[PDB]
Amino acid sequence: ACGYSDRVLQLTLGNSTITTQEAANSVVAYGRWPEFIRDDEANPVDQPTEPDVATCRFYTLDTVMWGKESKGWWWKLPDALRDMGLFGQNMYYHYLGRSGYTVHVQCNASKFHQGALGVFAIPEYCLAGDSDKQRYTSYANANPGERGGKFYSQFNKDNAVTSPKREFCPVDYLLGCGVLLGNAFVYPHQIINLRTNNSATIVLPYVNALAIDSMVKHNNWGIAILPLSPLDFAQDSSVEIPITVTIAPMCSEFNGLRNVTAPKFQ
Amino acid sequence: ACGYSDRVLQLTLGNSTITTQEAANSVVAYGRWPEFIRDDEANPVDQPTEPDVATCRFYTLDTVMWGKESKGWWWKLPDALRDMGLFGQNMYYHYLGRSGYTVHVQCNASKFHQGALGVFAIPEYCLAGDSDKQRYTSYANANPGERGGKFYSQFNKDNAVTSPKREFCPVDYLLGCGVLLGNAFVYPHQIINLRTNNSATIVLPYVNALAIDSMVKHNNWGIAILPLSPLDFAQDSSVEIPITVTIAPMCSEFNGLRNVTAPKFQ
Amino acid sequence: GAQVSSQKVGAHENSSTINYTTINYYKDSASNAASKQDYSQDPSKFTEPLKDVLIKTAPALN
Amino acid sequence: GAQVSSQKVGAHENSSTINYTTINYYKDSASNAASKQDYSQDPSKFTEPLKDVLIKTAPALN
Amino acid sequence: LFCGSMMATGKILVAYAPPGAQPPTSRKEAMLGTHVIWDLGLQSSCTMVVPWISNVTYR
Amino acid sequence: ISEV
Amino acid sequence: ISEV
Amino acid sequence: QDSLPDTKASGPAHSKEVPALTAVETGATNPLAPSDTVQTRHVVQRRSRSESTIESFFARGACVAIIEVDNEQPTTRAQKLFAMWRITYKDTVQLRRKLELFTYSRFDMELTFVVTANFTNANNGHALNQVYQIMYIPPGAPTPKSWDDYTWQTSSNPSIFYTYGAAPARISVPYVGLANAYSHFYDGFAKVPLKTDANDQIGDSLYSAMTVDDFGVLAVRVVNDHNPTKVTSKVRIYMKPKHVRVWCPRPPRAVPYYGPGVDYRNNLDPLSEKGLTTY
Ligand SMILES: CCOC(=O)c1ccc(OCCCC2CCN(c3ccc(C)nn3)CC2)cc1
Ligand SMILES: *C(=O)CCCCCCCCCCCCC
Ligand SMILES: *C(=O)CCCCCCCCCCCCC
């Protein structure tokens, strides 16, 4: 009744509120809302830390620019949030941590702009690398933090055997992992088609083979954003519009407290 | 029944346990156990952060040495705990914070050692300063953190008008604040008399004119430790034994989340 | 709205219970005089702040 | 003709409901003091003067 | 209130930081406090509530 | 009296 | 009156 | 009834109960009565603690301020045609020490104003009776620059108009604190210095000081236009805390006060000389 719509939403977590007047409904990955570890599925015996509103809230990452040449962007979770306020502190002070996420991708333009972004949430997003060398991508390179990583139109093998770059080389039509992009739609996803919507909203459960795990050693979800259809505007052959990613941890809980983990990121 | 005693205690908070075989019972300041802000006494309207086991646990500060010349030691709360794990992070990420404390002071020696420490928990422990200049002690000096401050047998006025030290000059028999030490016993306290006990245990409620306040701007409790009777052993005119202070935050809650407070301590 | 209470009579004339009458003339309670009939309390929170308060005929340390 | 009402007690002595008494001495109501017990009202005539007042969780423009 | 043309679109972040830290110079810092991400569209205006968060009962 |  |  | 406990008749003892022995290390005061260590008779105790109740202890008008104001010809140099006073119990020592036996307090306040005046010089004719205006200026309100500028219009600020010779003026004030209790002591600051600051003056505060104006000022003037002859007047303010409640006891001030904070400077030696075995 009154005037409610699929397109107009308000999301509120902690002291953060998002409004959107042009959404295309919202996805709940695998039909599962985030929930806490139940006693009959519990494994670490120690009383957990549940930081609630201080960590379960909307952290906005650094904005990226979408242009005619952009091949795609990718992020890993929890890694993208490792430095985000009290969530980051809790993550590094505890051996174990589990958390679900609300993912909100933002990209507005105009009635005369054109293009379509595929937004995918992938469980265990294992990416391919640089070299002849198998499974060689270094920790610091596998983990870009907030910055994220990028996609490529083709595979350039890291040639310098003497001092190997040890990076990922994710080719766009192979979803950076040896499969075809068109089938990535079997993963929880939405599409931001500029004529249709400003944003994407995907709610993610904790997905893993275990009830809880090391957040520093292992990423649970990967967020891959690719231009399914390239950006275009009027005749201006150098158009550029912003894409902003905002993420909230949900039902976050931590186990195994001790001194802080300080990973070497250099 | 069985064999239970005033002298033998176990305290367990979070993943920390203290045992003591020689205690002299324990004090609950003003007869009040720590409790959370009740709805009918609440003032900030925002849903609080309650970190529980991650912050409400036993943080051990750096040990001090008690010798024949020691005039006394003092600490302020929350200041002494400002850098202690996740408690410190919560304290600095929020405009507001309230917390009670279990204070456990430790000092063992031998059946042939001698001496007595007065351990006092003072609400609003305002200390006196350096100078001719009234109310001039600087923030960095008023706040020693974990390190604590010391007492003096007499008042030496900071003479260098040109570049003032801006420090406290706390004279021991005046409780560092213009009153006589013998009357400090009206404050919640215990005595560690070496022939009688290893330690002191004082449980502290949140005491203030407000239900909650800025932990960075204001210290609620002061812990003052003074040699009521000097340390002595056999004939060795240079005896020295350790005093170790261990403190746990209790029923900690925080309000007003935003970016972190970084105080200039130089 | 008259208020009536008993005075604690110290020195007594060669003449029982004696009373006095009070009426508040102002709306703000601040304007009121002091009742001076005040309740007393236990020193305990100050004199015995112990977790396990022990009885005086028993050993303080056991 | 005495008038009796309850004071809103702010700071309380260590001693419940407290009263005050009022009597009008003059025939003209103008001569009277102020009761100060006053009723409050809706901001609505100012904050929402709409013909079709709409509910806050719905679109203002529909 | 956005008084631009209807063909104009945009997303804005408005925020409130309770006292005690460095006043926000970047969206990054501002994000951490109380905030509303306003999306421009048919509903012209956006409201951010500054919740009463204080130490003292009255300022 | 009129006690209100 | 209120006689106490 | 508020009388103290009656002394009980107590006889000889040969037992395993030892009230006389204790351990002050626990933090407790030993609850003994004379009957615990000596043989006592029965006394029906009639004494009472009525005069030591918090209300009774503070129920007295204490001098907290002497405001001096002059009535004379407005010349063009620094005069006293009007005066201002920051409201505090701290310009005086006697009440300050009583209130400071406690960390926190709550009370309504009674202010009573005694106003005396006199002639300065041998003679320039005389003066007709003076009326004094005492205006309270709450923190934020416009402060007077001149003895008769617009601020004295007092349209919202409370003013008392006192007539010389009349019974001393009196008003009552509510509990006006920003907190749930008045803090007699504040171990803190109104500002924190931050690493990101430009000068380090920006984050600097006075130790133990809360708000800058805290409670505001009383502005005093003689409403009368000046006579040829000058009249000097003094307003003595007496304050009484009524309907009092206090929290957290503190040791009494033992050495002389050195301004608004707990600072000490000299006469740090309160105790007399007395021989250990000399009665
Ligand atoms: C640390 C300083 O002293 C105090 O803590 C302290 C001192 C005084 C006290 O009283 C409140 C002070 C403000 C009051 C004092 C005087 N007031 C008025 C009001 C009207 C008039 C005509 N005259 N005086 C109204 C406001 C409350 C606390
Ligand atoms: C209760 O007070 C009713 C009985 C009143 C008896 C006469 C009181 C005379 C004084 C009235 C003072 C009025 C102040 C405005
Ligand atoms: C109602 O007011 C009847 C009770 C009166 C009690 C005594 C009032 C004393 C004051 C009377 C004032 C008369 C003024 C002409």
Curated annotation (Swiss-Prot), chains A, B:
It is found in: Virion; Host cytoplasm. Coiled coil: none annotated. Interacts with capsid protein VP1 and capsid protein VP3 in the mature capsid. Forms an icosahedral capsid of pseudo T=3 symmetry with capsid proteins VP2 and VP3. The capsid is 300 Angstroms in diameter, composed of 60 copies of each capsid protein and enclosing the viral positive strand RNA genome. This is Capsid protein VP2. It comes from Poliovirus type 3 (strains P3/Leon/37 and P3/Leon 12A[1]B). The lineage of its organism: Viruses, Riboviria, Orthornavirae, Pisuviricota, Pisoniviricetes.
